[PDB]
Protein backbone atom coordinates (compact mmCIF):
# COMPACT_ATOMS: atom_id res chain seq x y z
CA UNK A 1 0.00 0.00 0.00
CA UNK A 2 1.08 3.61 -0.66
CA UNK A 3 0.69 4.37 3.07
CA UNK A 4 3.73 5.98 4.72
CA UNK A 5 2.59 6.58 8.32
CA UNK A 6 5.09 8.59 10.39
CA UNK A 7 7.32 9.80 7.55
CA UNK A 8 7.27 11.68 4.23
CA UNK A 9 5.89 10.07 1.07
CA UNK A 10 8.82 10.92 -1.21
CA UNK A 11 7.22 9.01 -4.13
CA UNK A 12 9.08 10.09 -7.27
CA UNK A 13 6.88 11.22 -10.17
CA UNK A 14 7.15 9.61 -13.60
CA UNK A 15 6.40 11.18 -17.00
CA UNK A 16 2.64 11.28 -17.61
CA UNK A 17 1.66 10.92 -13.95
CA UNK A 18 -0.65 13.45 -12.25
CA UNK A 19 0.79 15.95 -9.76
CA UNK A 20 -1.29 18.02 -7.34
CA UNK A 21 -0.49 21.55 -6.11
CA UNK A 22 -2.60 23.78 -3.83
CA UNK A 23 -2.22 27.56 -3.77
CA UNK A 24 -3.19 27.97 -0.09
CA UNK A 25 -1.87 24.69 1.35
CA UNK A 26 1.49 24.75 -0.45
CA UNK A 27 4.34 26.49 1.38
CA UNK A 28 5.68 27.40 -2.07
CA UNK A 29 4.82 26.38 -5.65
CA UNK A 30 7.30 23.48 -5.70
CA UNK A 31 5.23 21.72 -3.00
CA UNK A 32 3.34 18.76 -4.50
CA UNK A 33 1.22 15.69 -3.77
CA UNK A 34 0.87 12.42 -5.68
CA UNK A 35 -2.48 10.85 -6.62
CA UNK A 36 -2.23 8.31 -3.77
CA UNK A 37 -1.73 11.09 -1.20
CA UNK A 38 -3.90 14.01 -2.41
CA UNK A 39 -7.15 14.11 -0.44
CA UNK A 40 -9.90 16.28 -2.02
CA UNK A 41 -11.43 16.56 1.49
CA UNK A 42 -8.41 18.68 2.48
CA UNK A 43 -8.94 21.18 -0.36
CA UNK A 44 -12.67 21.95 -0.78
CA UNK A 45 -12.91 25.16 -2.85
CA UNK A 46 -9.12 25.57 -2.66
CA UNK A 47 -7.25 26.60 -5.81
CA UNK A 48 -5.93 23.17 -6.78
CA UNK A 49 -3.69 22.81 -9.82
CA UNK A 50 -3.41 19.29 -11.23
CA UNK A 51 -0.73 18.97 -13.89
CA UNK A 52 0.76 16.16 -15.95
CA UNK A 53 4.41 15.44 -15.14
CA UNK A 54 6.81 15.96 -18.05
CA UNK A 55 10.54 15.45 -18.76
CA UNK A 56 11.27 18.80 -17.08
CA UNK A 57 9.15 18.92 -13.90
CA UNK A 58 10.70 15.91 -12.15
CA UNK A 59 10.40 15.52 -8.38
CA UNK A 60 8.82 13.85 -5.36
CA UNK A 61 5.62 13.90 -3.29
CA UNK A 62 5.72 16.18 -0.23
CA UNK A 63 2.93 14.47 1.73
CA UNK A 64 4.00 14.03 5.35
CA UNK A 65 6.70 16.70 5.04
CA UNK A 66 5.04 19.19 7.40
CA UNK A 67 7.49 21.96 6.41
CA UNK A 68 6.02 21.93 2.88
CA UNK A 69 2.43 22.64 4.00
CA UNK A 70 0.49 25.43 5.75
CA UNK A 71 -2.32 23.12 6.91
CA UNK A 72 -2.29 19.61 8.41
CA UNK A 73 -2.93 17.13 5.59
CA UNK A 74 -4.75 13.79 5.80
CA UNK A 75 -3.10 11.29 3.43
CA UNK A 76 -5.60 9.62 1.07
CA UNK A 77 -3.54 6.38 1.13
CA UNK A 78 -4.19 6.32 4.89
CA UNK A 79 -7.90 5.86 4.06
ZN1 LIG B 1 2.52 10.79 -2.07
ZN1 LIG C 1 0.62 10.61 1.68
ZN1 LIG D 1 -5.44 23.05 -0.15
Q: Annotated binding site for Zn(2+), which residues? A: 4, 9, 22, 25, 34, 37, 43, 46-47, 61, 63, 75
Ligand nearest the Cα of residue 41 is 3
Question: How many CA atoms lie within 13 Å of 76's alpha carbon, on the beta-carbon side?
Answer: 13
50: enclosing H helix or E strand: strand 48-52
DSSP type of residue 66: G
Whether 63 and 33 have beta carbons less than 8 Å apart is answered as: yes
Report if residue 58 sits inside a domain.
yes
Beta-bridged to residue 18, according to DSSP, are: 52
In angstroms, this model's resolution equals 2.1
Domain-located, residue 4: no
Asked how this structure was determined, the answer is X-ray
Q: With respect to residue 50, please indicate whether it lies within any of the assigned structural domains.
A: yes
Provide the residue range defining the domain that includes 28.
Answer: 9-79
> Would residue 1 count as lying in a domain?
no
Which ligand has the minimum distance to the alpha carbon of residue 75? 2
Residues 6+ apart with CB under 8 A from 55: 15
Burial pattern 5-36, b for ≥16 Cβ within 10 A else e, equals: eeebbebebeeeeebbbbeebbeeeebbbbbb
- DSSP states of 14-52 as a string? -TT-EEEEETTTBSSTT--B-TTT--GGG-TTS-EEEEE
Amino acid sequence: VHKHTGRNCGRKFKIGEPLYRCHECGCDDTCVLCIHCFNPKDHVNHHVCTDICTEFTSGICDCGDEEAWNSPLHCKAEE
